[PDB]
Amino acid sequence: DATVYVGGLDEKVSEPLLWELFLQAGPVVNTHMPKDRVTGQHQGYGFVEFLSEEDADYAIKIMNMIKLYGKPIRVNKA
Amino acid sequence: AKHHPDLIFCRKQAGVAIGRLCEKCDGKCVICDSYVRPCTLVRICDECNYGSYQGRCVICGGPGVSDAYYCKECTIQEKDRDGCPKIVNLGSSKTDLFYERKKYG
Amino acid sequence: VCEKCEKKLGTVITPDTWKDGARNTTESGGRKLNENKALTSKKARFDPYGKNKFSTCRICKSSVHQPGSHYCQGCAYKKGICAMCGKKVLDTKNYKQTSV
Amino acid sequence: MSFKREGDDWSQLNVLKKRRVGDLLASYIPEDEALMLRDGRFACAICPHRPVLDTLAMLTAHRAGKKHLSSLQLF
Amino acid sequence: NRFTVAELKQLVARPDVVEMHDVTAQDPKLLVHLKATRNSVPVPRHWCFKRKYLQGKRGIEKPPFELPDFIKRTGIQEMREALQEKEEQKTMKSKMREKVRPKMGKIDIDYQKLHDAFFKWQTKPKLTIHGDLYYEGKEFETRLKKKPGDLSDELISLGMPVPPPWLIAMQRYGPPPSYPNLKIPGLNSPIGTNAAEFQTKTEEEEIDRTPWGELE
Amino acid sequence: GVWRNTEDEILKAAVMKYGKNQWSRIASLLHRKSAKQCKARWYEWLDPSIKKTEWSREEEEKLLHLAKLMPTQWRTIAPIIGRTAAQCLEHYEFLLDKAAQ
Ligand SMILES: [Zn+2]
Ligand SMILES: [Zn+2]
Ligand SMILES: [Zn+2]
Ligand SMILES: [Zn+2]
Ligand SMILES: [Zn+2]
Ligand SMILES: [Zn+2]
C-alpha cells in the first residue's frame, strides 16, 4: 500500500504543497506529481511512497479530508 | 621542495649553525617555498655545515648569500621543528637538466 | 615622490629582486620578522576613519589613488611636483609636457 | 604604433584563433546536439551517457566516431 | 568465523547504525561502537560507488555562480558586462591600437562605495553545522519533510476559522494506525480539561531574557 | 607535421566553408600547418571524392594493364583508374606480392 494514486487536481496545486497536504495525514517520503514538459502543465494525478504500510492504509481515508480548489481528490492503493 | 616529491630532507637534530640561501633562493621559505612573511631563522645540523660546506645554500647547495627563514605559516603549523631542513639528494630534475644541456652544448 | 616623502610610500609584499636601495627586503628592515598583518594594516593604506582618508586632487578634484597624496598623477606630472607634499622635483620650463 | 601597426601579440592572437575555430566548427553542429557547460566545455547530447569534451574540435572529432554514430541512429 | 548482521545488531548498544558490510571488518565490535559514538561524522557515502565523485549527468546543467547581494550593490557586474560586450566587437587592429594609446578613467567605482560593500553591508551566508557532509545529490534533495498538527500558511486553501476540517472525520473514522502516539484536539487532546497552554503562558511570564555580557 | 584527428576535422569544415582556393585562410585556423600542407592533405586523403573502399575486379585489371603500359608514372595513371596515386601505388605492390605467391 506504500504508494497511492491521486486523481482530479488543478495545476496551481504543487508537489511541495501536495507533500504538506498528505503529511497532514502522515509523511510522504517519496512524492511524484508529474510535470508535463510539452505544454508545461499538470494533468493532476499523483503517486505517493511512504515509510511502511502505515501511510498506505490511511491513504484512502486521507482522500476524504483532501479538497483542493473546491474539489475532491482520488486516493487508492498501489 | 614542495615541487619535487623525490627530494629528501636531512632531519637530524638541528644545532647552532644558521642555514643560508644563495641568490637564486633568496627570500623564499625552505619548507613550503613561499616568498612572503618570514617568521623564524633556520638552523642546520652539524654534519650539514661540515668543512667546505659551511655556508652553502640549504635548498639547492650554491654559495649562500643571505640567511634562511621559515615563513609564518610553517611556524604556526610547527613545521620549523621537524629537524635539519637541508636537502640531501639532488633528485631526478637536477640531473636530467645537466645531461640535457651537456648533450646539446 | 620627493626624497623626504619616500618613508610614506607603501611596499610590495614580495621582496625586490634588485636588493640595493630596496625598502621591502629583510636586510633593509622594511620586511620585518614576525609581522602581525592586523597591526600594520592601516599603515600606508586607505582608512576612511583613520588618518589617510579618500582624498581628491587639490587642483582637478578627482580622486587620488595613493594614500596621503594631495595631487593626482596627471596634475603632479604636469606641474612637476611631489604628489604628496607639492614640492617641485622637476624644472619644467623647457619641457612641453605631453599627456599623450 | 597607431599610424602603422607594429608587432603582434601572439598570445591574444592564439585566443582569437581559438574563437574562430570555435565559430567555424559550431556552425555545423545543431543546437540540440551539443550542450555547453558552465566552464566552457561541451557535452554531446545524443549519446545517453553525455560524454563531456574539452573543445569543439574534440566534439567534432567525437561526432565522427563510431560510438556516436551508433548512438545517433537510435535517436 | 564471522558475525552475521543479526548477532552484531544485538551485540551493539545501538543497532541502527550497522550495515551489510560491517561484519566484513577486521574488528567489527569496535567499528560499530565508533559509529554510534556522539558527534562523529560518517564516512562519505560514495566510497563504494563505481562512478567517480561529482562526475554525474545532473551536474552537467549547473548554472553559473551568482554574486552575493552586497557585491551586486556596487554595480560591478553591469560595468564589466558592458565592457566585455564592447570588447568582442573590436578587431585585433583596434585592440592593438588602444594598447598604444590607452584610455584612462574608464571603469572606476568610487572607493567609498567599495569600502561600504565590505565593511558595512557584508552579511554572513548560510552556513552548515559540523557533520553535515556534502554529497552529490544534496542540493536537490534539500526539500526534506512538516508534521501533522503543524500547518503551512498556504494550506489559505482551506480558508477555515481557527480546527481542521478532516478531524470532523478522524474522530468518526478513528485514530490513524500509522501514528501510535499522535494527539489532536477533541479526540484525545484538550480543545478532559485544557490547562496545557496555560503552563506555557505562566512559564513565559517567569523568564527573564536578557543576554549577559553583550555590547552596550 | 603529422595530422591529428582534430586538425582533420577543422580542415574538412574549413574547406566546406571557404572552398578550395583560399588555403591561406585555412592555414590560419590550424597550428603549424602551412597552406601547401593543407592543400596536400585535402587532395591526398580528406577529399570526399577519394574512394576508400575495396578494389573491384575491373579496377584491378585496369591497374595491372596501365602499370605495364606507362611504368612508374602514377600521376598519369591515377585519374584513369579513379584512385589516388598513392592508393594505386600501394595496391599495385600488394598485387605484386600476391602474385609472388
Ligand atoms: Zn640556493
Ligand atoms: Zn613556509
Ligand atoms: Zn643536516
Ligand atoms: Zn589632479
Ligand atoms: Zn614630497
Ligand atoms: Zn555523441
Curated annotation (Swiss-Prot), chain C:
The keyword DNA damage does not apply. Coiled coil: none annotated. Keywords: Cell projection, Cytoplasm, Disease variant, Dwarfism, Ectodermal dysplasia, Hypotrichosis, mRNA processing, mRNA splicing, Spliceosome, Synapse. Pfam families: Cript. Residues 97-100 are annotated as: PDZ3-binding. Belongs to the CRIPT family. As a component of the minor spliceosome, involved in the splicing of U12-type introns in pre-mRNAs. Involved in the cytoskeletal anchoring of DLG4 in excitatory synapses. PANTHER family: CYSTEINE-RICH PDZ-BINDING PROTEIN. Component of the minor spliceosome. Within this complex, interacts with RNF113A, as well as with SF3B1/SF3b155, SF3B2/SF3b145 and PHF5A/SF3b14b. Interacts with TUBB1. Interacts strongly with the PDZ3 domain of members of the DLG4 family. Associates with microtubules. Interacts with DLG4. This is Cysteine-rich PDZ-binding protein. The gene is CRIPT.
Curated annotation (Swiss-Prot), chain D:
It is found in: Nucleus, Nucleoplasm; Nucleus speckle. The lineage of its organism: Eukaryota, Metazoa, Chordata, Craniata, Vertebrata. A zinc finger (Matrin-type) spans 42-74. As a component of the minor spliceosome, involved in the splicing of U12-type introns in pre-mRNAs. Plays a role in the regulation of primary cilia length and Hedgehog signaling. A motif (Bipartite nuclear localization signal) lies at residues 4-20. The modification Phosphoserine is found at residue 2. Component of the minor spliceosome, which splices U12-type introns. Within this complex, interacts with RNF113A, as well as with SF3B1/SF3b155, SF3B2/SF3b145, SF3B3/SF3b130 and CDC5L. May interact with LUC7L2 and SNRNP70. There is a cross-link at residue 67 (Glycyl lysine isopeptide (Lys-Gly) (interchain with G-Cter in SUMO2)). It comes from the Eukaryota. It is linked to Orofaciodigital syndrome 19: A form of orofaciodigital syndrome, a group of heterogeneous disorders characterized by malformations of the oral cavity, face and digits, and associated phenotypic abnormalities that lead to the delineation of various subtypes. OFD19 is an autosomal recessive form characterized by tongue nodules, dental and digital anomalies, narrow high-arched or cleft palate, and retrognathia. Some patients have notching of the upper or lower lip. This is Sodium channel modifier 1.
Curated annotation (Swiss-Prot), chain E:
Transmembrane segments: none annotated. The modification Omega-N-methylarginine is found at residues 51, 58. Changing residue 80 to K: Does not affect methylation by PRMT9. There is a cross-link at residues 35, 86 (Glycyl lysine isopeptide (Lys-Gly) (interchain with G-Cter in SUMO2)). Changing residue 50 to R: Moderately diminished formation of omega-N monomethylarginine but greatly reduced formation of symmetrical dimethylarginine. Abolishes formation of omega-N monomethylarginine and formation of symmetrical dimethylarginine. Methylation at Arg-51 by PRMT9 is required for the interaction with SMN1. GO terms for cellular component: catalytic step 2 spliceosome; nuclear speck; nucleoplasm; nucleus; precatalytic spliceosome; spliceosomal complex; U12-type spliceosomal complex; U2 snRNP. The modification Symmetric dimethylarginine is found at residue 51. GO terms for molecular function: RNA binding. It is found in: Nucleus; Nucleus speckle. Component of the 17S U2 SnRNP complex, a ribonucleoprotein complex that contains small nuclear RNA (snRNA) U2 and a number of specific proteins. Part of the SF3B subcomplex of the 17S U2 SnRNP complex. SF3B associates with the splicing subcomplex SF3A and a 12S RNA unit to form the U2 small nuclear ribonucleoproteins complex (U2 snRNP). Within the SF3B complex, interacts directly with SF3B4. Found in a complex with PRMT9, SF3B2 and SF3B4. Interacts (Arg-508-methylated form) with SMN1 (via Tudor domain). Interacts with RBM7. Interacts with ERCC6. Component of the minor spliceosome. (Microbial infection) Interacts with HIV-1 Vpr. This is Splicing factor 3B subunit 2. It comes from Homo sapiens (Human). The gene is SF3B2.
UniProtKB/Swiss-Prot annotation, chain F:
Changing residue 23 to G: Abolishes DNA-binding. Phosphorylated on serine and threonine residues. Has no effect on subcellular location nor on homodimerization. Phosphorylated in vitro by CDK2. Phosphorylation enhances interaction with PPP1R8. Residues 1-48, 49-100 form the HTH myb-type domain. Signal peptide: none annotated. Changing residue 45 to G: Abolishes DNA-binding. It is found in: Nucleus; Nucleus speckle; Cytoplasm. Ubiquitously expressed in both fetal and adult tissues. Homodimer. Interacts with DAPK3. Component of the precatalytic, catalytic and postcatalytic spliceosome complexes. Part of a spliceosomal 'core' complex consisting of CDC5L, PLRG1, SPF27, CCAP1, CCAP3 and CCAP6. Interacts with PLRG1, Lodestar/TTF2, and NIPP1/PPP1R8. Component of the minor spliceosome, which splices U12-type introns. Within this complex, interacts with SCNM1. Component of the PRP19-CDC5L splicing complex composed of a core complex comprising a homotetramer of PRPF19, CDC5L, PLRG1 and BCAS2, and at least three less stably associated proteins CTNNBL1, CWC15 and HSPA8. It is linked to A chromosomal aberration involving CDC5L is found in multicystic renal dysplasia. Translocation t(6;19)(p21;q13.1) with USF2. Belongs to the CEF1 family. This is Cell division cycle 5-like protein. It comes from Homo sapiens. The chain holds residues 9 to 109 of 802 of the full protein.
